[PDB]
Structures are given as structure tokens and as C-alpha cells.
Design a protein around this ligand. Sequence first.
Ligand SMILES: CCCCCCCCCCCCCC(=O)OC[C@H](COP(=O)(O)OCC[N+](C)(C)C)OC(=O)CCCCCCCCCCCCC
Ligand SMILES: CCCCCCCCCCCCCC(=O)OC[C@H](COP(=O)(O)OCC[N+](C)(C)C)OC(=O)CCCCCCCCCCCCC
Ligand SMILES: *[C@@H]1O[C@H](CO)[C@@H](O)[C@H](O)[C@H]1NC(C)=O
Ligand SMILES: *[C@@H]1O[C@H](CO)[C@@H](O)[C@H](O)[C@H]1NC(C)=O
Length: 1598
Amino acid sequence: MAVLRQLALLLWKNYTLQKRKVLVTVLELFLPLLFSGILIWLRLKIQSENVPNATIYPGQSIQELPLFFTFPPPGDTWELAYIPSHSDAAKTVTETVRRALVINMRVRGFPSEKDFEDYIRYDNCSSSVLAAVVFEHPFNHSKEPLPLAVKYHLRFSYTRRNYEGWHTTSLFPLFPNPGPREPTSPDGGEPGYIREGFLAVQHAVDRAIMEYHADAATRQLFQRLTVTIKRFPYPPFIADPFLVAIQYQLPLLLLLSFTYTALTIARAVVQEKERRLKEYMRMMGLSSWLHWSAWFLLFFLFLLIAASFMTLLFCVKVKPNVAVLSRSDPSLVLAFLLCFAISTISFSFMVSTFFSKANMAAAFGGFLYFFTYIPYFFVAPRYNWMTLSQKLCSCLLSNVAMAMGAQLIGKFEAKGMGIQWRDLLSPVNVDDDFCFGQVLGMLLLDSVLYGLVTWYMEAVFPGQFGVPQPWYFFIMPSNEYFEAEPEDLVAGIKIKHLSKVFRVGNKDRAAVRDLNLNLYEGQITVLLGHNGAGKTTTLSMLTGLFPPTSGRAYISGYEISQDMVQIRKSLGLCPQHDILFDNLTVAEHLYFYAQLKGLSRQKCPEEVKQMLHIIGLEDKWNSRSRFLSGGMRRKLSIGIALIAGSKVLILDEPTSGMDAISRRAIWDLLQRQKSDRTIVLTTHFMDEADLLGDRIAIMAKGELQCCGSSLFLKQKYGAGYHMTLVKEPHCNPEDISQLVHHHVPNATLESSAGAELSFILPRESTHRFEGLFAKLEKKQKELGIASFGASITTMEEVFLRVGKLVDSSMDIQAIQLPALVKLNTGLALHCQQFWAMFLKKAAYSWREWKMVAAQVLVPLTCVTLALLAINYSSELFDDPMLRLTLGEYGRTVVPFSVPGTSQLGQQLSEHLKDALQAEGQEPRELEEFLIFRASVEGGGFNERCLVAASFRDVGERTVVNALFNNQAYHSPATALAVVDNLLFKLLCGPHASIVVSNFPQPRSALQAAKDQFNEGRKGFDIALNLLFAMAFLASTFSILAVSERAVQAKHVQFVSGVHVASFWLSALLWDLISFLIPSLLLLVVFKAFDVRAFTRDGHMADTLLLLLLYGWAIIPLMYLMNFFFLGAATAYTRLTIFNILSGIATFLMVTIMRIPAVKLEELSKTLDHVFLVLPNHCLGMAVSSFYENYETRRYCTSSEVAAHYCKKYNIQYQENFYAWSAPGVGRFVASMAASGCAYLILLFLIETNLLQRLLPEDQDVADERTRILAPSPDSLLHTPLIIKELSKVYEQRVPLLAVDRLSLAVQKGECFGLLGFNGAGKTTTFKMLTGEESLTSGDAFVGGHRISSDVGKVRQRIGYCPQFDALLDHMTGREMLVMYARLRGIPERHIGACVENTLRGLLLEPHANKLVRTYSGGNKRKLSTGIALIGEPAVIFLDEPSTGMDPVARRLLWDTVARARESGKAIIITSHSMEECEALCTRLAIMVQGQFKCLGSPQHLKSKFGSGYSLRAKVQSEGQQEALEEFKAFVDLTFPGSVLEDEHQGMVHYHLPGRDLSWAKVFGILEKAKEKYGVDDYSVSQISLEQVFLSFAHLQPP
Ligand SMILES: CCCCCCCCCCCCCC(=O)OC[C@H](COP(=O)(O)OCC[N+](C)(C)C)OC(=O)CCCCCCCCCCCCC
Ligand SMILES: CCCCCCCCCCCCCC(=O)OC[C@H](COP(=O)(O)OCC[N+](C)(C)C)OC(=O)CCCCCCCCCCCCC
Ligand SMILES: *[C@@H]1O[C@H](CO)[C@@H](O)[C@H](O)[C@H]1NC(C)=O
Ligand SMILES: *[C@@H]1O[C@H](CO)[C@@H](O)[C@H](O)[C@H]1NC(C)=O
């Protein structure tokens, strides 16, 4: 009904906010197309062969060795050794082999395999050995027969003779191409077994062993039987290699396509939680799921455009039968991409509930996307073994469930099916039960399994602002101080016996006890309250955050505990912060919030038009919410608070941090806008709580203390008036105090600061004021008084006294109210600043240990875990055993036919069936049977069927064809093995056996030294592995340098006088010291793994130099790149990426642009000269070229033959390791040492600023100006500030005279004011005095030193308190004071005392050692102004010293700032609150448009620019309908010129004109008329200082 209205109003907002960011939207649609258009290129760059049918092979003979051993070698005859020599049984078996393979072979005999293994490698004639028969029996030394169980080797050459090794390490090819292993070569192929002569020798040895036992039947049997060998015929096949590369490039190119729009979801979701906008909407009625639904319906509808396009350009027939995923039903591709999209949205929602900042979440949730894809590189190959449950459990990571589904799209596409909606359940081959339905299901299950984690972490760990819930929440289904309240007005908030008690003694909040307040309509009520006393528990119960305990409170006739859902209809409210979306207009916020508050669509626009008028923003309409102000945003927030008609209106601190005009505008707004509604303020200013507030309430200990109007409270909780004089040089305070006390008895000389003399005249003696003022009017010149005045108490005193009567804390008991050394210089200074700046940088590595566990632990793992995955070797082995017998594979299945008509087949088939070794028999009925079978079996044929048998006798001759599966390496031997194994049991007793082996010969000395030299795939692979771990380390140096400049902490330090060299050469020293712990922990790793290219010789001190030279060259480059960034976490992720692209990309763009005359690219010589300025490409190409030189040297040294080979082929190793033009690292050392010195120079040339330099004015102002041009002989020598004829002109397209001649002279014991209008130049004068800005035509003498010449000796004598908080969160309350006591001098023996007394002067001792992050927002303003006062400064430049502080702590600070001025200093305040420029000032100066318009103490200003008085009388309730006008007529008769100006329920407020009214006459008149006209109380006061300041408001140029 209306939920559907909110769900669309909340979706228009998201769509608008998101399409206003053009670079992100356009970059989210051009990644998933740039990454999927690559496949179109890669497909049109590859063709498919697709043989028709019928590839079959002929047969070979194994009777005689190939026609290569007929010719003898250069040298002698061939050799054939046997290893058991002493045994005669083996001695005679080899001789029949010799007389069966007659060439000239000489038979040798050896003791044992040790002797042969030493003969082959340690000789020069041991090169013509052909085979070597080895047995497995001790043989009972001299004579013994051969036991019927025989095993033996043959053992061999090592490299192909007739023509790589024998591949005994493996058993199937590692990278199987599609098709036959050797399409040509109809006899075996690569491993040998035919060309070499393995089979001929094996058959001969088998025949020898047969004749050794039969010798007679053998001749008969082999007279009518010969054995040949044939290869399987291979079926017609698809030859396309691209379909094999779709199972490793599709998943990665899908993930890399969605991985950006998967991290702009986390940022968008968390950025709106960080700004507390979701918390604001949740307090208007919107539930917490309306936001997730509106995020989902946007990002899903936005990913469905990319998925459709991706589906389209996968499956468009570019050319006849092309277009990757050619026959694959595009609807199913789309329906799989949509499930991937839902999963990758629901993943980001879950990720965004772990972070508070938007930068961190965006950076570190775009990384977990990748990090959840890793376990697929370890499942892509090992896929045929895994059981179903393990495969299904691996899918709980959505990025892996997608990849195992992108593999099936290749495994189906390489067969002709090409998934078609009707095989969702059918497995792939016949036996691997894992369909394509369990991919979609596991993709849509992880969505829910992630929703269940976000819904729990959003409710139990809400963050900093929300309120948590119990972890099991898914279980339960659930006096005389009070004035008389008005009678005309109707209550709009009624509270009765409200109460709340919190949890166990872990209080941490504030309790209310028995509140009985009451708030009325058409009236502003101000709710004050001391520090711990309720007042935010109360405003939380009323606004609906938690229920009460023992009370009830009605808002608009409802009750907060029963039906809050209807209260929130009229209750509008605006908080402390700002609730506005940047990138929406002024006109859109109102149209959004008016309707969200439940306003009809047809009747909205006129209220938007009216509210744009009430606020006063007709112009500046449809401006973004950025670019407005700081002072029209507080007006738009107030506008939102009361749009659509809202009765109750709870707004707090509405005028915080605003100048004095934008504050009166808001006051006037709120005064015109009540009239109908109840407003509840709460402020920290104690005159805003008085000027606009008609009824006030104060809470002290969770219990309402006093209530009533302002005049009611002031007459009850305050002392008398505040009469103030202005004494002159020839004056005596003693001669005036006698007058005052002798005339009025009770009084108090409150203070005599400056030249004021203020008293306290109690108000229970107002009948003597006639005499006092009449008498003191006369003796003006005789006494020395000029322009006195009087006023009544303030509201700060009332507030401070109420809480003092009913509290006992340490602070509130401190306030008092009226009752009832040579600084260092030269060398010590610089060496002291160096230490101070070194400790600051050092103490960050162990108070934030995320940088130690990421400088020491990331490089180590990144280097070891990826040396493991390479299997770094440094050693070579010698091709181990491989027993040639069926069974190392597994349970096979062996067919055999009997296409015979005669005998010699049946007995053989029965014996074969008696194998019972591996598989059964699987008899068939051959050549064509295999062709048919090898099309429906698929991969099963090449895993369960390796051999065959076919006994086809042509009458007498009985051939036995044995077939071998070429897809294996060692099949042609196993086939003959089984064939002759059974044919030997034929003419023997079947209790025997024959197995053999392969186990090739060991390498010689000259072969190992060449098979070790061809490990060139190690330098290039160990350089990339290290360049990738030095990019997660080089970036951690620009984090303190970014987060210190962003918080403005660097600006204050440079103002206080730190040197541009001590600042940076002290960061560099520590960043080099912190570049050895990893740089020395890498030697341990390279030693443990034994990487010899740089461990063996004195090279451990040559990698260390190469790593120090890289640290030295990249640290200063990472210092320069910090000037781009503002957040410490958007710089890490943008600088590691810069490192990786500057490194890997441009180092890999040179090695593979030099491939052995393939892609030519002779310009690599130019690229490797243009890339010599990047210090990552200079490390990669130095490590690689070190590892290469050492290898090619260690080779061309082992023997002379190698040296000759190197000479012929021009290998050119250098023996210096550091020379030029070589494999030596000379031009890389020399280019990293000269690049780290061209960055320091450029850093200092940026810091030291070599870019920006490559008319009746007033009587008192003129008096001041001409008092410092013609001074007394020594009138100005002991004074701090002597500004003289100071000016500054801009050149921004028009001469702007922002300062005009500014002649002033501040003295010891002063406190200058310097007020001004917005843009009057009060903020360039401040800068120009603190040394920041360029001067023009005039000087200033700060302490004795000119400000145009010696601007370095000045900065050591001035303190400076900024407006913002420029503190270093990793330091301590006391360490930050020690830092600044060192940057200024203060010999090391005094620092203890100078810090100890300051800390307890500001009352910071509890928090002295507390790590300034725990500090409340008001203990930071107490420390920023202890930093200003530490040391002995000549001048102090305070600037809004107490911004966000409550009244008690603010008073306690204004006290110290004045106790520091009593004892001979000079202060310069500059603030926006006119309440603070009176509590600590001695002389003021309003400044408009260029220059001073007035000057003098705040009383001399009120006399000279004041107008008159202001009455505030009230009349009792007796005849209020009759006495009010009777009094109101009298005050228009006896005071000609009054203005009524206000009226509220008992009271008036006049503006009695000051023309001809003494301070005596006005009191006599009212004191006589008090009783004759029935008045309850009254109070006369003079003009207010802020009202005097506002008089000059018309002098603004616009
Ligand atoms: C498993 C399948 C799916 C899993 C996805 C869902 C699980 C997500 C877990 C990952 C996040 C772990 C929790 C986490 O990050 O804590 C938050 C802080 C960031 O703080 P921050 O963002 O300032 O605000 C805190 C948010 N709050 C209030 C809710 C705690 O976290 C940090 O501060 C970031 C940590 C700094 C980097 C760590 C580097 C130190 C050493 C590196 C580790 C060993 C080196 C090899
Ligand atoms: C498209 C792919 C993009 C991703 C590619 C590579 C990006 C690397 C992801 C990790 C980035 C984490 C960023 C980070 O930790 O910030 C450095 C911290 C910030 O501390 P802090 O000053 O509290 O942060 C405030 C700044 N803020 C809010 C904007 C973050 O300052 C520190 O305290 C030092 C911590 C730095 C060490 C972080 C290194 C750990 C990364 C490896 C994590 C592996 C987990 C097993
Ligand atoms: C080859 O070996 C024989 C002994 O077998 C030895 O006499 C001869 O010096 C060797 N030749 C060379 C070149 O070392
Ligand atoms: C092998 O023959 C020897 C002949 O000297 C004899 O010790 C025994 O019969 C056999 N030895 C072993 C250890 O079986």
C-alpha cells in the first residue's frame, strides 16, 4: 500500500545518486566488455582441423634391431653387459642373446650395480654400452639355476641414440594435447621403445629364458608362431585447441569482469552508514529492510544489462560455426550469469557489515573477492579424483562454484552437446555424477547463506551508533523552585513519573529518576542539564530508542510505550550532525523528505514552494548540497525538520559553529515558526538559551532541579547587578570603593582587570541605586570615571550555581561565583629537533602493529609459499625405477579376441583369462571394436584400457598381434610383457612369473653439467616472485606521511618552527632502519632453500647491497606520491597497484618481447633504456641477470669441453658481476643509486616552496595610529607586538586590498579581540602574523624581530592553537607536550618541570599517559591549548579555543587562559562567539571591509555605540487583563519613544530610548512605580555587546 511507495521513493534516490557519478558508472560497463571481447580476438586467432575419420596404423616387427645398429660407431663394437657376473646361470643366458642379436657385441660382466653405476659415469670408453641385464638374486655364489620367478632390468642408454629421457618419473603426459600423441610416427613415437631398441632386447631375453628351461618345445612353438606389435587406431576427433583453453581463461575473465562492480557495492553501502543517514531514516519510520531491497533492485537491474551484453557477444556467429560457446543455448548461459550476479551482490552486502569506514571497505572487499578464488587453482587439475561431497563442499565459496560451472561449459562444448536445458541433471561422461544443476543450486544457496550472516551481524554488532541486541535474539517472539505553568496554552508533551534504570554497575550512561516535566504549544522550551544528569536518556526515550522502566509519557495524546508508530508521524527532528546527500539539489531534498513523511503527491509542490520561502532559499535553488555553505545547510536541515506539517519538533544544538549573522537568521526563523507547534531545544550556549527560550529546565543528577522563565530564574538564583566603570590614568580604586561601600553597604569588587573596576550590587538594595548613580554622576572628572554602566546577571551564572548546590564532583566544586630560561639555538636546537622528530616516527611502528605484521610477515610468506609452488630444485635426480607390469595404473580392463579357426588360440585365451592380476578379461569379437568403443567411453578408454590381444592364425603360422595405447608412455613394453609372460607359462608349469623394469642409466659427468645449465626458468621465476613481495612493502612508507598531513598535524609543526631537513631526514633514517628486518630475513629463506646463485661465494653480501640500494631508491619516491592522497587506505591500494604495474608489467614487457626471433621486437633495447628510471624494473632485471651470470659462469668452468662450447656459441659470462653491457648488474646499481638522489632533491624543491615563486575613520583608531609613529623615547621597546602600517594586496584578476594599514600595538598583560565580518580580512591578518602568508608594504615586530626578514627567529617565540584538532592519535597526552617543548628549545633539564606544571594547570593529569585516541572531544581542546602555552612564548594566537565544550569545562579553561595573561603575556583571540570575547578580553576591535572601525574595552564600546536601556517587567495575576494595559499605557507616557517589542503571558520587553535618561532617573521612576501599579518584578540592563557588533552589519559591501 505505502510500503510500495517508500520502496520506489527509496529507489529513485539511489538511481539518481549513482548516475551522478559518471566515471564510476561508465567504468563499470567498460570492464565487463573489455574483458569479454578478448575472447573474440583469441578465438578468431585460432582454427580447428576436425579430421573426417579413419586414422589407423600398420604393424612393426621386433625380431631385429632397427637399421641403425648395423653400422658400428666411431670407435669399437657395441657392448652388452650383465651385472650378476660370478653367477654362471646369468653368464650363459646372455650368450644366447648375443647369438640372437649378432652384430659384434662384446659381453662384459660386472660385480654389482655399484660398479656399473661408477663405470658409466667415470670413464671415457663407457659410451658404447647398449643394454645391461640385472637380476634380483644373491645366487649362492658359484652355481644355481634360474628360479621360475625371474625379474630383471635392461637399463640402457640415457639420451636418444637413433634420434629427452625415458620419462620414468611420470606415467601419463602432463599437458595432453587433443588427438593422437604422435600423429605421424606409426611406431611408438617420443619415449622410444622401438627406435632405441628396448623391445628387441626384451623379446630376445624372454626367448633366452624360455630356451633355458625348455630348449626343445620352444623351437617347435616358435617355428609356427611370431609376435608383432601394433598401435591402437584412433577415432575421428575435434582438433580445436581453443576449447581446451576455455577451462582456464573463462573463469578468470568472468571474475575479473565482475570484480569492480562488486567493490562499488560495498563502498556505496558503507558510505551511507558512515554518514549516519541510515540511522536518521530509521528514526522516521522506515524499517531496516527497505534499504537492502532498494540496494538490491538497483544493483541487480544494473548487472543484468552487463550480463545480457556478455551473453550476446559470447554467442553471435561471427563466422560460420565460430563464436565461443558455439552450440550452447544462450538462455542457459544468461540464466547462469544471473545466478552469479545474485551471488556476487549478496556477497558484498555481507562484506559491508564488517567495516565502519568507506575507504577500508572498498579497498578490502575488492580484495576478498579475489582471495575467495584462490582454492580453484588447486582444484582445476585435481578434479577427476574428488568425490561428490568434496566437490559440493568446495562450492560454499561462490567464486569457486562459478568456476566449476564454467569448466562444465567447456567439458560439454568439447563434445558437441553444449548444455541445453535438458541435461541439467545428467552427469558429464557416464560415471562422474556431477551435473550442471548442482552448480546453479549451490550458487543460489550461498546467496541465502550470506543473507543469514548479514542479518545477524547487522543486528548484534551494529557498529558505533546503533544499539545492539542479545546474541540469542532469534528465540523470543517479542516545590517553590517551579514557576506556575501557563493556562492559555495546551500541553503537547506530557511526562508523568518517568524513570529509567540501566544494567549492572557497568553503567556508562545516565539514569533518570522520577521526571515530571511538561511542555506547551506555541512556545520554545530549552532543556539544559549538567554533565552526567539524564537529558540524553530522556530525549532517547521520547524519540523511541529504548522503552522506559516505571513511567508513562504522552506526546500528542498517544503514549510512547504503546504506539510509537503513530507518534513518529508528527514528530520531526534534526540532529547535531548534517543529514544531507551530496549530489542532490536543495529542491530534491524537500521533495524526497516531504513524501517520505507521508504527504500526498498532488499536494506536495505548493508546500515545497512555501518552505523554500520560509527558509529563504529561492535563489541557490537546485544547487547541489555540496557547494552551499556551512550556514545554509543548517538552514536546510531545519527546513527538513518541519516540512509536511509536524507538531512536536525536537531539535538540538541548532546554531553550532556559525558566525553572528547566520545565527540571528536562524533565531528569527524559529521565532516566526513556532506559533502552532511545540519546540524543544537543547544548546551549549548560555545566551541562546536565554534570548530564545520561554521556559527553561535544568537537570543536575538525573532529577529536574528548577523550571520556569528566565526572569523567574535570575531573580532567584543570582546575585545583583554588574555595575562597571572605565577608570583613567589619574584614578584611584581606593577613592571609588569608599564611595560605593559607604553609599550601598553590601558590594564586592569583583575584578579590576584592564581598566574596568566592576562591582556586584545585590538586587535586594535597589532603593539606594538612585543615590548611588545620582551622586556618581557628578564626580566624573574629580574621581576619574568615564562612562560607567550596569547590567543584570547572566544565565551562565544561574546554570553554574544550580549544579553547584546539588553536586560534589571535583570540577563543579572548583568554579567560583559571587557569594549568596634561555632557549637553545645553533647546534643543540637542530640536534634536539632531530631527536624529537625521530621518536615521533619511530613510536608509530609499535603502537600500530598492523605495519609490523605487514612489513615482516607479508614478504616472508609471499616469497616462501611461492618458492614451494615452483618446487625450486638446485639438484637433479636420475630417473628412478618403473616396473613394467600392469598394476601401477590400477584396475584396468583388457579385451581379447579369438578370430581363429584352428588351435593355438583356445589354450592361450584360457591362460590369459587366468591372469587374475588387474582387470578381468572383457572378451570381445577388434580393430573396429576399439574404434567404436573409443567414442562413447571418452576419458575412460585412456584410463582403464591400455593393452589388447588378437590371435589370428593363417593356417600353420600363428601370429599374435599385441596392441598398445599410445596415450601412455610405457605401453609398448607392458603389452609384450604380459604376452610373453603367458606364452612362457604355456611351455612351463604355471607357478612362475616374469616382470622387468625400465630404470635408465645414470648421467655422466658431462651430461649433468649440461642438464643443470638449462635451468633458465628459475631466474625469471624468482625475480617475479620477489618483485611481487616488494610491492606490498614499499607502499607502507606513505601512511604516516599521509595521515599526518590529512589531519593537519604537519601544518602546526611547521608553524612552530621545525626545519625542513630535520623533518624528512629523520623519517628517512628510520625508514631505512626498518628496511633491514625483511631485507635480512630474506637471506635466511634463500639460505634454507639453498638458492646457490647468491649464497655460495661471498654473495650473501651482494644480495643485501642490491636490496639496500632498492630501499634507498624507492623510499623517497613513495614520499613524493603522498601529495596525491587524503586517506591512508586509498593510498595503500593505489600505490601497490602502481608498484605492480611499474614492476611486473614493464619487466614482463621486455622478457617476452625478446622471444627467440618469434615476435622480433628489436626495440626492446630502447624500452630497456626508457624504463631505467623506474626503481622496480631496475630490481627485477638485476636479480634475474645476477642469477643468469652465475649459472653461465658455473657451466663454462666445469670442463674444457664446456668452455669450447661457450666459445663457439658466444655465451659471454662476465667475472666481475658489476661491469657494464653484460649479464652484469652495473647499469642497475648505478641507476638505483642515482635515482634515489634525484628524488630527495625534488622533494626538497617542493617543500621549500620553489613552485609558487616560479573619511572620518574613528578618533581612537587614529589616536592609536599616531601614538606609534611619534612615540615616547622608550615607549615601544619592551612590547611584544608592534604591527605598523601593514597591508596586503591580492592579484586575483583585480587588486583586492584585503588589509589596510592596520596600525596596532599590543602589550604585556593584554588580550586583544579582533572581531570581524565574514570576509573582512580578519583571517589574513592572523596568517600574516603567524608567518604563513606573504607580506606587502609594512612590517610587524613580533618580540623584537621583523616579520619580513627574520621569520625563523619569530616562530620560536609564538604559540599557536588552531581551530581544528591537529593531534597524532598514536601518541600520548604527555609525549605530545614533550615534542613541542623540544621543537622550541627548553634545555633538557627543565622539560620535566615545564610539562609537569602545565599538565596539572590544565587539569589533564588523569589522562597524561593515555594514547590520544581515547580522548573525548573536550579533552582535545584542553590539550591543543596546552601546546600553545608550553615553553615561554612572547605571543599566543588562540583561535576558538573552546569550541565543542560544555559550560563547566569551558569555564575551567577560560580561567587558565586568563591566569596566563595576568602573569605578563599577550594573547590574540579570534572567535565566533561573542560570549567568549567578553569572558576573556581586555580590548576589542571590530574590522569591516579593510580596517579597524572601533577600538577599546567592551565597556567603552557599549558607551560610545550604545543606544538606551531595555526593560523586562512583569505584572501579577490579580488583574492581568486590567493591569497589563494600565502599566503599558504608563510606560508610553513617562518614556516617550518606547517600543513594545515582545509579550509572553505576563511580561513586556521595551527599548526605552536613551536620549536624556540618567541611570538614576530611570531607577527612581521604576522604583516608585513598582508598588503603585502592581508589578511583580523587573530588570533594567544596558545594550549587549553582540548587539553592538551587529550594528556595523550594514557596512558590508554587498
Ligand atoms: C571466508 C569466506 C567469506 C569471508 C567474508 C566474511 C568475513 C570477513 C572477515 C574479514 C574482515 C575481518 C573483520 C575486520 O576486518 O575488522 C574490522 C577492521 C577494520 O576496522 P574499521 O574498518 O576501521 O572499522 C571497524 C568495523 N567494526 C566496528 C565493525 C569492527 O579490520 C581491519 O582493520 C583490517 C585488518 C588490517 C589488515 C591486516 C594486516 C595485518 C597482518 C596481515 C595478516 C597476516 C599477513 C600475511
Ligand atoms: C583490485 C584489487 C585491489 C586490492 C589490491 C591490493 C590492496 C590490498 C588490500 C589491503 C589494503 C588494506 C588497507 C589498509 O590496511 O590501510 C592501511 C592502514 C590504515 O589504518 P588507519 O589509519 O586506521 O585507516 C584509516 C584510513 N582509512 C579509513 C581510509 C582506511 O594503516 C596501517 O595500519 C598499516 C596496515 C597496512 C598493512 C596491510 C597489508 C595487508 C594486505 C594483505 C592482507 C592479507 C590477509 C591474509
Ligand atoms: C680414456 O681412457 C683410457 C683408459 O680407459 C685412458 O688411457 C685415456 O687417457 C683416456 N683418454 C682421455 C682423453 O682422457
Ligand atoms: C647360498 O649358497 C651358499 C653357498 O656357499 C650357502 O651359504 C647357502 O646354501 C645359501 N646362502 C644363503 C644365505 O641362503
